[PDB]
């Protein structure tokens, strides 16, 4: 099954289809975080595991800013990783419910800080998957999730 929501790329530098100005990831892993990511350190483990696995990564979180955002962009440009980041849809309680929906749709697990989950301890089994993902300035489309 697929889904779509009104949240565009957090940076035009995630674009990998110049002509159209879109982001297209094939058979990617999907990280679902209910927190704001500002320090990349806590991300290294999952990033390494995904990079070593040879798959692209879509990040859906509260936000991805500062150094965090910058390193993701620079290392995708350097070909060390291939990732894209967007904010979670909706607000408040609706955001949590929708984030959980995507998880179920993709067989992923929401890394909830509320219930005390650590991103450093996140594993590939916690990540979701889908056949394809398309992102533009305004929307994110998940195609055929596991």
């Amino acid at each position: 099954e697929g889904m779509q929501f009104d949240r565009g790329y957090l940076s035009p530098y995630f674009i990998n289809k110049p002509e159209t100005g879109a982001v297209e990831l094939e058979s990617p892993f999907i990280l679902l975080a209910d927190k704001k990511i500002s320090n990349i350190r806590e991300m290294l483990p999952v990033l390494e595991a995904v990079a070593k696995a040879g798959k692209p990564l879509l990040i859906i979180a509260e936000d991805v800013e500062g150094e965090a955002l910058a390193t993701l962009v620079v290392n995708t440009m350097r070909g060390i990783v291939k990732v894209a980041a967007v904010k979670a849809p909706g607000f408040g309680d609706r955001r949590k419910a929708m984030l959980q929906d995507i998880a179920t749709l993709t067989g992923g697990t929401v890394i909830s800080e509320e219930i005390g989950m650590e991103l450093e301890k996140a594993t590939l089994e916690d990540l979701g998957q889908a056949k394809r993902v398309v992102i533009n300035k305004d929307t994110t489309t998940i195609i055929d999730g596991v």
Binding site: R41, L44, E48, E67, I80
Partner: peptide, 11 residues
């Protein structure tokens, strides 16, 4: 900025 053994450049 440092570079992990696998080449990831970060602060």
């Amino acid at each position: 900025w440092m570079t992990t053994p696998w080449g990831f450049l970060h602060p």
